[PDB]
């Protein structure tokens, strides 16, 4: 983090500056660095603050000839790495490779500079603190700085390609993680050119990711297209139109528990959505969704709608009886109460409601059995945090099933107050039907807009709206504390004044007006101020920024709908039985092609 | 001002045109101006309307050879400036320098033309009347016209760099104040090149502003970057990423009472906000806000929210007793009144309200002690006029504390009518919580939008809305003056007709409708006209221009939020004790660097 790196950098510059050997290595004096090196008592193993030698200083400031004098004074400076924590394995070869001083790389490799050196300090890790991630080996350093000849020269002296770091990343992984993609595709070609073969391309990191899977996850569409140039075979071309066969082994991921498409659609990187726009992935999901995914999602949508209708019908016809106790209160409004369990089921219609309630609790147990192990199979925050996988819809469906089982416990144990979980369950259950809106293009991104207004716009403006409601509700309550509550009951106590001011903010109830009595004038002053600031200004401000939130989602409508039908497709292929979801693509074994599955794409060009 | 300048210009052209010597100097006649100059009785000291000589006329119309004949006729014309008020010190050298006639500059400097001449007329001051501001000395004139060789020639003949004018501005100040910056940066380089040294760069004007501070205040981002090229030192570069150390002495402004960042953020010039986008300022405020400013602002926000909760709770539980006098009026609605001070505190809950009220008045005194001297330390209009410093929020918090102290005066002196300052104090206090919305990016510019709709849109449309309310309220009142007020009480008297028409404009109450009686038909005609013009047309017009006001603020959202967290950071560093705010940046004294503080920035490039 920042102050530790700053302390390390000024200490390193101080130990360069005070030491005359390191200063002469820094500023490249040929008047100096010959009198000092002719002393046999002079310490050529003098280290800086981070344990770096004078050769590290000469490689850092691009002093080639000073590094040659430091090398001929003592040849062991190439073997020595730095020692302190942010640079705990860095050699002078790493600095010469990053600086791309190629004659210095030849001068170091003429000496005994190790090519298998691991620069495993904290300044070389993949972190948000570090501005780059190049790896720990000099070969990955030379691949990431983009110099071809240093890569070939490291190949000429050792430096095997298959080197895995602390993250398990091969040089192909780190080259995929670089921001410049077209500048690194040529390096990916030349690094694959020295492959002698478990292949180099198929070895994973510590996250289990293949370079194909890492190119899919990180949004590297250029590298994905480059990797699918070598996985495709043009069957024929004829005039404008050509038929080509894409290998579907790395994309479909049949035997894998965590598939490639599931890895891409549930990735934190946003640009992985443009991975879904690339061709064999696009026709693969189009075949999976049109052939199987849309009818299965439609019959699940209709079955859930019928289950909601059964739940709603057993909610309307719930057992209620006239209350035995008397009212004796003009404010009291309840004329009937809940029925006891011993008298709830005495008739035929109550038995019809019983089989409806049994269907309801069976469906809630089915929901819990379907959605509880998929919380545990992935990250618990990752399951609910995803806007594409239906995470908010997942937590709504989970708490709906929990409220239905709580209602069953309340019914079996004769607990009064069954209105509460039944009302929450009705609202959350019928709002759960919007999960199936993602199966259609016409109302798919509408729920994405609704989600981006719930947690996008409402969570920020709710604080300003809340403090306006608190101030005007407090003023409205204390200006009516001295008045008769029969003539104007909107602000009689503090919770009903809070609720009335919330409804007057949203303009869903009328302004309180009794023209048969004369109200306080401070009601008129504070309500004119409230109607100016809250109903007129802040409400339409919230409406306008909801509008441009809707505009921002509507610009990316097709990509977001494509991503959520991908998440729906991989969810349905993962959850449903294997006989209902046959393996996608051309089988290939009967055509002489060996145990590989393919997708044929015919496209029209010039 | 305009007519005086016009009268001066036509008088000057008249005195040129009537005088044959000045006419021959104007239109460059070599047939003339040899017969006239051979007369020994001819007055070569003949002056125009502004006291300008014939050499001023020859320098004004770029007549070089006419100026040579005027100089060899009488060499003292270079020593004479003009005399009347808009040009009370202007010489012919100033006109020759502005015209960039360099041979005329050599011809004047061959004679005894003073280079320390001050053209201190009203046409050379920094005013909105004058279209340019070049200064009073010819060296600043040559710097601001951008001619390099005239600057070098003036250096060859006197003309010291460190010349301060009536505004105290050095040539560096005036060169910063020029609108075209990149062509003036090389002139700044040349003017710093003849510095022999209190330095030239550190001398202030009469406002106390350094050229660094003036470049920050005026929004000169190009000159700010040029001034920070000489205040930075690259520690190292390595491949794509470099670490460089910025001097933080001129930016942090430790011992100064009016700091650099406070000068930039409270400046009237708008482009100074882009000064906040430049690099060491940006990481300095990012370090100050993330390390210290955001937690201190968050604990102050939570403490103010708890103080509002205590004030609101002692507002709800205020002492009220049943009224002794009888009602005897069907319109009368008050059933209880304020309690006397002798009986207000008799119970334990009244003592809890007493310690809450003591906390409330202590907080109001604390607010007044914190915000009254900062009105006086700056401009009184400047404190409240700033949208970034929280000036409207400052006057709301000031009047909230004033209303709380007025409420304490009413409580101690048993004054009836305590609803009024308590209701205003509740509204203004809970609206003061939006001051702390600027500490978060997600709801920071929302209050800027609210302010730009209060004083931007509402103050212009309130007049049109007001005259519509007056006309329709007057018509609604006089069409119901003849009717029974029991059947329709919305327009019974003129203030309630005004309030009803305001609420019907905002559509927060229903249209008045009694279907048990037959209303006047002019109520239906005027309400149809009102519903067309006011509820439908002008209200949605106000909503639409509120929407594009919101759009205009949302385009500059990050810059406005950055400016207001800068104002928050400099407010918190100025107000809070020094032990809670340590000095920002690297100390530097332990690294051998002499008594200067630095900020290290590491950045990634090609
Ligand atoms: C009762 C239901 C509970 C639901 C539980 C689940 C609630 C939940 O998980 O929502 C998280 C929500 C959005 O989730 P998510 O991480 O997927 O959204 C990302 C990010 O939040 C951006 O704001 C999005 O907009 P933009 O492109 O940058 O403009 C962008 O969407 P997209 O570009 O990829 O489409 C995404 O990068 O994040 C919040 O906004 C903070 C509010 C916290 C949520 C409030 C938690 C109470
Ligand atoms: C009760 C609370 C009292 C509050 C007391 C304090 C009230 C108060 O001081 O507001 C002043 C207000 C805005 O102040 P301020 O000078 O900072 O705003 C500038 C200017 O007014 C422009 O209109 C702004 O918009 P734009 O960019 O050109 O489009 C621009 O904002 P920004 O670009 O910098 O962001 C600024 O250059 O000026 C008025 O609009 C006239 C209404 C007079 C105010 C009405 C006075 C009653």
Coordinates of N, CA and C in Angstrom, one line a residue, chain A residues 321-495:
Chain A
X321 N -63.0 -16.8 11.0 CA -64.3 -16.9 11.7 C -64.6 -15.6 12.4
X322 N -65.9 -15.3 12.7 CA -66.2 -14.1 13.4 C -65.7 -14.1 14.8
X323 N -65.2 -13.0 15.3 CA -64.5 -12.9 16.5 C -65.4 -13.0 17.7
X324 N -65.0 -13.8 18.7 CA -65.9 -14.0 19.9 C -65.9 -12.8 20.8
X325 N -64.7 -12.1 21.0 CA -64.7 -11.0 21.9 C -65.3 -9.7 21.2
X326 N -65.8 -8.8 22.0 CA -66.5 -7.6 21.5 C -65.5 -6.5 21.2
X327 N -65.9 -5.5 20.5 CA -65.0 -4.5 19.9 C -64.8 -3.4 21.0
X328 N -65.8 -2.7 21.4 CA -65.9 -1.7 22.5 C -64.8 -0.6 22.3
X329 N -64.6 -0.2 21.0 CA -63.7 0.8 20.7 C -64.1 1.4 19.3
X330 N -64.4 2.7 19.2 CA -64.8 3.2 17.9 C -63.7 3.2 16.9
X331 N -62.4 3.2 17.3 CA -61.3 3.1 16.4 C -61.1 1.6 15.9
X332 N -61.6 0.6 16.7 CA -61.4 -0.8 16.3 C -62.2 -1.1 15.1
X333 N -61.6 -1.9 14.2 CA -62.2 -2.1 12.9 C -62.3 -3.6 12.5
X334 N -61.5 -4.5 13.2 CA -61.6 -5.9 12.9 C -62.9 -6.5 13.3
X335 N -63.6 -7.1 12.4 CA -64.9 -7.8 12.7 C -64.8 -9.3 12.8
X336 N -63.7 -9.9 12.3 CA -63.5 -11.3 12.3 C -62.0 -11.6 12.4
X337 N -61.7 -12.8 12.8 CA -60.3 -13.2 13.2 C -60.0 -14.6 12.5
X338 N -58.8 -15.1 12.8 CA -58.3 -16.3 12.3 C -59.1 -17.5 12.9
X339 N -59.2 -18.6 12.1 CA -59.9 -19.8 12.6 C -58.9 -20.7 13.2
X340 N -59.3 -21.5 14.2 CA -58.5 -22.5 14.8 C -58.2 -23.7 13.9
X341 N -57.2 -24.4 14.1 CA -56.8 -25.5 13.3 C -57.7 -26.7 13.4
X342 N -58.4 -26.8 14.6 CA -59.3 -27.9 14.8 C -60.6 -27.7 14.0
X343 N -61.0 -26.5 13.7 CA -62.2 -26.1 12.9 C -61.8 -25.6 11.6
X344 N -60.6 -25.6 11.2 CA -60.2 -25.0 9.9 C -60.6 -25.9 8.7
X345 N -60.6 -27.3 9.0 CA -60.9 -28.3 7.9 C -62.1 -29.1 8.3
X346 N -63.3 -28.7 8.1 CA -64.5 -29.4 8.4 C -65.4 -29.7 7.2
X347 N -65.1 -28.9 6.1 CA -66.0 -29.0 4.9 C -65.2 -29.5 3.7
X348 N -65.9 -29.6 2.6 CA -65.3 -30.1 1.4 C -64.4 -29.0 0.7
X349 N -64.8 -27.7 0.8 CA -64.0 -26.6 0.3 C -62.8 -26.4 1.1
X350 N -62.8 -26.7 2.4 CA -61.6 -26.7 3.2 C -60.7 -27.8 2.9
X351 N -61.2 -28.9 2.4 CA -60.3 -30.0 1.9 C -59.7 -29.6 0.6
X352 N -60.4 -28.9 -0.3 CA -59.8 -28.4 -1.5 C -58.7 -27.4 -1.2
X353 N -59.0 -26.5 -0.2 CA -57.9 -25.6 0.2 C -56.8 -26.4 0.9
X354 N -57.1 -27.5 1.5 CA -56.0 -28.3 2.1 C -55.1 -29.0 1.0
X355 N -55.7 -29.5 -0.1 CA -54.8 -30.0 -1.1 C -54.1 -28.9 -1.9
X356 N -54.7 -27.7 -1.9 CA -54.0 -26.6 -2.5 C -52.8 -26.1 -1.6
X357 N -53.0 -26.1 -0.3 CA -51.9 -25.8 0.7 C -50.8 -26.8 0.7
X358 N -51.2 -28.1 0.5 CA -50.2 -29.2 0.4 C -49.3 -29.0 -0.9
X359 N -50.0 -28.6 -2.0 CA -49.3 -28.3 -3.2 C -48.4 -27.1 -3.0
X360 N -48.8 -26.1 -2.2 CA -48.0 -24.9 -1.9 C -46.8 -25.2 -1.1
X361 N -46.9 -26.0 0.0 CA -45.8 -26.3 0.8 C -44.8 -27.3 0.1
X362 N -45.4 -28.2 -0.8 CA -44.5 -29.0 -1.6 C -43.7 -28.2 -2.6
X363 N -44.3 -27.2 -3.2 CA -43.6 -26.3 -4.1 C -42.5 -25.5 -3.4
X364 N -42.8 -25.1 -2.1 CA -41.8 -24.4 -1.4 C -40.6 -25.3 -1.0
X365 N -40.9 -26.5 -0.6 CA -39.8 -27.5 -0.4 C -39.0 -27.8 -1.6
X366 N -39.7 -27.9 -2.8 CA -39.1 -28.1 -4.1 C -38.2 -26.9 -4.4
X367 N -38.6 -25.7 -4.2 CA -37.8 -24.5 -4.4 C -36.6 -24.5 -3.5
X368 N -36.7 -24.8 -2.2 CA -35.6 -24.9 -1.3 C -34.6 -26.0 -1.7
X369 N -35.1 -27.1 -2.1 CA -34.2 -28.2 -2.6 C -33.5 -27.9 -3.9
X370 N -34.1 -27.1 -4.7 CA -33.5 -26.7 -6.0 C -32.5 -25.5 -5.8
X371 N -32.7 -24.6 -4.8 CA -31.9 -23.4 -4.7 C -30.9 -23.4 -3.5
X372 N -31.0 -24.3 -2.6 CA -30.1 -24.3 -1.5 C -28.7 -24.9 -1.8
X373 N -28.6 -26.0 -2.5 CA -27.2 -26.5 -2.9 C -26.5 -25.6 -3.9
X374 N -27.2 -24.8 -4.7 CA -26.5 -23.9 -5.6 C -26.0 -22.6 -5.0
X375 N -26.5 -22.4 -3.7 CA -25.8 -21.3 -2.9 C -24.5 -21.9 -2.5
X376 N -24.4 -23.1 -2.1 CA -23.1 -23.7 -1.6 C -22.2 -24.1 -2.6
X377 N -22.6 -24.3 -3.9 CA -21.7 -24.8 -4.9 C -20.9 -23.6 -5.5
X378 N -21.3 -22.4 -5.2 CA -20.6 -21.2 -5.7 C -20.4 -20.3 -4.5
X379 N -19.8 -19.2 -4.6 CA -19.7 -18.2 -3.6 C -21.1 -17.7 -3.1
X380 N -21.3 -17.6 -1.8 CA -22.6 -17.1 -1.3 C -22.9 -15.7 -1.6
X381 N -21.8 -14.8 -1.6 CA -22.0 -13.5 -2.1 C -22.1 -13.5 -3.6
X382 N -21.4 -14.4 -4.3 CA -21.4 -14.4 -5.7 C -22.7 -14.9 -6.3
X383 N -23.5 -15.7 -5.6 CA -24.8 -16.2 -6.0 C -25.8 -15.1 -6.1
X384 N -25.8 -14.2 -5.0 CA -26.8 -13.2 -4.9 C -26.3 -11.9 -5.5
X385 N -25.0 -11.7 -5.7 CA -24.5 -10.4 -6.2 C -24.6 -10.2 -7.7
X386 N -24.9 -11.3 -8.4 CA -24.9 -11.2 -9.9 C -26.2 -10.7 -10.4
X387 N -26.2 -9.6 -11.2 CA -27.4 -9.1 -11.9 C -27.8 -9.9 -13.1
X388 N -26.9 -10.8 -13.6 CA -27.2 -11.5 -14.8 C -27.8 -12.9 -14.4
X389 N -27.2 -13.6 -13.4 CA -27.6 -14.9 -12.9 C -28.9 -14.9 -12.2
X390 N -29.5 -13.7 -11.9 CA -30.8 -13.6 -11.2 C -30.7 -13.7 -9.7
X391 N -29.6 -13.2 -9.2 CA -29.3 -13.2 -7.7 C -30.3 -12.5 -6.8
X392 N -30.8 -11.3 -7.1 CA -31.9 -10.7 -6.4 C -33.2 -11.5 -6.5
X393 N -33.4 -12.1 -7.7 CA -34.6 -13.0 -7.8 C -34.4 -14.2 -7.1
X394 N -33.2 -14.7 -6.9 CA -32.9 -15.9 -6.1 C -33.2 -15.7 -4.6
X395 N -32.8 -14.5 -4.1 CA -33.0 -14.3 -2.7 C -34.5 -14.0 -2.4
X396 N -35.2 -13.4 -3.4 CA -36.7 -13.2 -3.3 C -37.4 -14.6 -3.3
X397 N -37.0 -15.5 -4.1 CA -37.6 -16.8 -4.2 C -37.3 -17.6 -2.9
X398 N -36.1 -17.5 -2.4 CA -35.6 -18.2 -1.2 C -36.4 -17.7 0.0
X399 N -36.6 -16.4 0.1 CA -37.3 -15.9 1.3 C -38.8 -16.1 1.1
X400 N -39.3 -16.2 -0.1 CA -40.7 -16.6 -0.3 C -41.0 -18.0 0.2
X401 N -40.1 -18.9 -0.1 CA -40.2 -20.3 0.4 C -40.1 -20.4 1.9
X402 N -39.2 -19.5 2.4 CA -39.1 -19.5 3.9 C -40.3 -18.9 4.6
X403 N -41.0 -17.9 3.9 CA -42.2 -17.4 4.5 C -43.4 -18.3 4.4
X404 N -43.4 -19.2 3.3 CA -44.4 -20.2 3.2 C -44.3 -21.3 4.3
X405 N -43.0 -21.7 4.5 CA -42.8 -22.7 5.6 C -43.0 -22.1 7.0
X406 N -42.7 -20.8 7.2 CA -43.1 -20.1 8.4 C -44.6 -20.0 8.6
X407 N -45.3 -19.8 7.5 CA -46.8 -19.8 7.5 C -47.4 -21.2 7.9
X408 N -46.7 -22.3 7.4 CA -47.2 -23.6 7.7 C -46.9 -23.9 9.2
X409 N -45.8 -23.5 9.7 CA -45.5 -23.6 11.1 C -46.5 -22.8 12.0
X410 N -46.9 -21.6 11.5 CA -47.9 -20.8 12.2 C -49.3 -21.4 12.1
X411 N -49.6 -22.1 11.0 CA -50.9 -22.8 10.9 C -51.0 -24.0 11.8
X412 N -49.9 -24.8 11.8 CA -49.9 -26.0 12.6 C -49.9 -25.8 14.1
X413 N -49.3 -24.7 14.5 CA -49.2 -24.4 15.9 C -50.2 -23.3 16.4
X414 N -51.2 -23.0 15.6 CA -52.3 -22.0 15.9 C -51.8 -20.6 16.3
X415 N -50.8 -20.1 15.6 CA -50.2 -18.8 15.9 C -51.0 -17.7 15.2
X416 N -51.5 -16.8 16.0 CA -52.2 -15.6 15.5 C -51.2 -14.7 14.8
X417 N -51.6 -14.0 13.8 CA -50.8 -13.1 13.1 C -50.3 -13.7 11.8
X418 N -51.1 -14.5 11.1 CA -50.7 -15.2 9.9 C -50.8 -14.3 8.7
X419 N -51.3 -13.1 8.8 CA -51.4 -12.1 7.7 C -50.0 -11.6 7.3
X420 N -49.1 -11.5 8.2 CA -47.7 -11.0 8.0 C -46.9 -11.9 7.0
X421 N -46.7 -13.2 7.2 CA -45.8 -13.9 6.2 C -46.6 -14.2 5.0
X422 N -47.9 -14.3 5.0 CA -48.8 -14.5 3.9 C -48.8 -13.3 2.9
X423 N -48.8 -12.1 3.5 CA -48.8 -10.9 2.7 C -47.4 -10.7 2.0
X424 N -46.3 -10.8 2.8 CA -45.0 -10.8 2.3 C -44.8 -11.9 1.2
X425 N -45.3 -13.1 1.4 CA -45.2 -14.2 0.5 C -45.9 -13.9 -0.8
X426 N -47.1 -13.3 -0.7 CA -47.8 -13.0 -1.9 C -47.1 -12.0 -2.8
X427 N -46.6 -10.9 -2.1 CA -45.9 -9.8 -2.8 C -44.6 -10.4 -3.5
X428 N -43.8 -11.1 -2.7 CA -42.5 -11.6 -3.2 C -42.7 -12.7 -4.2
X429 N -43.7 -13.5 -4.0 CA -44.0 -14.6 -5.0 C -44.5 -14.1 -6.4
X430 N -45.3 -13.1 -6.4 CA -45.8 -12.6 -7.7 C -44.7 -11.6 -8.3
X431 N -43.9 -11.1 -7.5 CA -42.7 -10.3 -8.0 C -41.6 -11.3 -8.5
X432 N -41.6 -12.5 -8.1 CA -40.7 -13.5 -8.6 C -41.1 -14.0 -10.0
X433 N -42.2 -13.7 -10.5 CA -42.6 -14.1 -11.8 C -41.9 -13.2 -12.9
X434 N -41.3 -12.1 -12.5 CA -40.5 -11.3 -13.4 C -39.1 -11.9 -13.6
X435 N -38.7 -13.0 -12.9 CA -37.5 -13.8 -13.3 C -37.7 -14.4 -14.6
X436 N -38.9 -14.8 -15.0 CA -39.1 -15.4 -16.3 C -39.3 -14.4 -17.4
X437 N -39.2 -13.1 -17.1 CA -39.3 -12.1 -18.2 C -38.0 -12.1 -19.0
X438 N -36.9 -12.7 -18.4 CA -35.6 -12.8 -19.1 C -35.6 -13.8 -20.3
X439 N -36.6 -14.6 -20.4 CA -36.7 -15.5 -21.5 C -37.2 -14.9 -22.8
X440 N -37.6 -13.7 -22.8 CA -38.1 -13.0 -23.9 C -37.3 -11.7 -24.1
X441 N -37.1 -11.4 -25.4 CA -36.3 -10.2 -25.7 C -37.1 -8.9 -25.4
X442 N -38.4 -9.0 -25.5 CA -39.2 -7.8 -25.5 C -39.4 -7.3 -24.1
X443 N -39.3 -8.1 -23.1 CA -39.4 -7.7 -21.7 C -38.2 -8.2 -20.8
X444 N -37.1 -8.6 -21.4 CA -35.9 -9.1 -20.7 C -35.2 -8.0 -20.0
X445 N -34.7 -7.0 -20.7 CA -34.0 -5.9 -20.0 C -34.8 -4.9 -19.2
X446 N -36.2 -5.1 -19.2 CA -37.0 -4.3 -18.3 C -36.8 -4.5 -16.9
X447 N -36.6 -5.8 -16.5 CA -36.3 -6.1 -15.1 C -34.8 -5.7 -14.7
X448 N -33.9 -5.6 -15.7 CA -32.6 -5.1 -15.5 C -32.7 -3.6 -15.2
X449 N -33.6 -2.9 -15.9 CA -33.9 -1.5 -15.6 C -34.5 -1.3 -14.2
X450 N -35.4 -2.2 -13.9 CA -36.0 -2.2 -12.5 C -35.0 -2.4 -11.4
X451 N -34.1 -3.4 -11.6 CA -33.1 -3.6 -10.7 C -32.1 -2.5 -10.6
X452 N -31.7 -1.9 -11.7 CA -30.8 -0.7 -11.7 C -31.5 0.6 -11.2
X453 N -32.8 0.6 -11.1 CA -33.5 1.7 -10.4 C -33.7 1.4 -8.9
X454 N -33.7 0.1 -8.5 CA -33.9 -0.2 -7.1 C -32.6 0.0 -6.4
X455 N -31.5 -0.7 -6.8 CA -30.2 -0.6 -6.1 C -29.3 0.5 -6.8
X456 N -29.7 1.0 -7.9 CA -28.9 2.1 -8.5 C -29.4 3.5 -8.0
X457 N -30.6 3.9 -8.3 CA -31.1 5.2 -8.1 C -31.7 5.4 -6.7
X458 N -32.5 4.4 -6.2 CA -33.3 4.6 -5.0 C -32.4 4.5 -3.8
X459 N -31.3 3.8 -3.8 CA -30.5 3.6 -2.6 C -29.7 4.9 -2.4
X460 N -29.5 5.7 -3.4 CA -28.8 7.0 -3.2 C -29.7 8.1 -2.8
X461 N -30.9 8.2 -3.5 CA -31.8 9.3 -3.3 C -32.7 9.1 -2.1
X462 N -32.7 7.8 -1.5 CA -33.6 7.5 -0.4 C -33.1 8.3 0.9
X463 N -31.8 8.6 1.0 CA -31.4 9.3 2.2 C -31.8 10.8 2.1
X464 N -31.7 11.5 1.0 CA -32.2 12.8 0.8 C -33.7 12.9 1.0
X465 N -34.4 12.0 0.4 CA -35.8 11.9 0.5 C -36.2 11.6 1.9
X466 N -35.5 10.8 2.6 CA -35.7 10.4 4.0 C -35.5 11.6 5.0
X467 N -34.5 12.4 4.8 CA -34.3 13.6 5.7 C -35.3 14.7 5.4
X468 N -35.8 14.8 4.1 CA -36.9 15.7 3.9 C -38.2 15.2 4.5
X469 N -38.5 13.9 4.5 CA -39.6 13.4 5.1 C -39.6 13.5 6.7
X470 N -38.4 13.3 7.2 CA -38.2 13.5 8.7 C -38.4 15.0 9.1
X471 N -37.9 15.9 8.4 CA -38.0 17.3 8.7 C -39.4 17.8 8.6
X472 N -40.1 17.5 7.4 CA -41.4 18.0 7.2 C -42.4 17.2 8.0
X473 N -42.2 15.9 8.3 CA -43.1 15.1 9.1 C -43.0 15.6 10.6
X474 N -41.8 16.0 11.1 CA -41.7 16.5 12.4 C -42.4 17.8 12.6
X475 N -42.2 18.7 11.6 CA -42.9 20.0 11.6 C -44.4 19.9 11.5
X476 N -44.8 19.0 10.6 CA -46.3 18.7 10.4 C -46.9 18.1 11.7
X477 N -46.1 17.3 12.4 CA -46.7 16.7 13.6 C -46.7 17.7 14.7
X478 N -45.7 18.5 14.9 CA -45.7 19.5 16.0 C -46.6 20.7 15.7
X479 N -46.9 21.0 14.5 CA -47.9 22.0 14.2 C -49.3 21.5 14.4
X480 N -49.5 20.2 14.5 CA -50.9 19.6 14.7 C -50.9 18.9 16.1
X481 N -49.9 19.1 16.9 CA -50.0 18.5 18.3 C -51.0 19.2 19.2
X482 N -51.2 20.5 18.9 CA -52.2 21.2 19.7 C -53.6 21.2 19.2
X483 N -53.9 20.5 18.1 CA -55.1 20.5 17.4 C -56.0 19.3 17.7
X484 N -57.2 19.4 17.3 CA -58.1 18.2 17.5 C -57.8 17.2 16.4
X485 N -57.5 16.0 16.7 CA -57.2 15.0 15.7 C -58.4 14.5 14.9
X486 N -59.6 14.8 15.3 CA -60.8 14.4 14.5 C -60.9 15.2 13.3
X487 N -60.5 16.5 13.3 CA -60.7 17.4 12.2 C -59.6 17.2 11.1
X488 N -58.4 16.9 11.5 CA -57.4 16.5 10.5 C -56.5 15.5 11.2
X489 N -56.7 14.2 10.8 CA -56.0 13.1 11.4 C -54.8 12.6 10.7
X490 N -54.2 13.4 9.7 CA -53.1 13.0 8.9 C -51.8 13.0 9.8
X491 N -51.7 13.9 10.8 CA -50.5 14.0 11.5 C -50.7 13.9 13.0
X492 N -51.6 13.0 13.4 CA -52.0 12.9 14.8 C -50.9 12.3 15.7
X493 N -50.2 11.3 15.3 CA -49.0 10.8 16.0 C -47.9 10.8 15.0
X494 N -46.7 10.6 15.5 CA -45.4 10.6 14.7 C -45.3 9.6 13.6
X495 N -45.6 8.3 13.9 CA -45.6 7.3 12.7 C -46.6 7.6 11.6

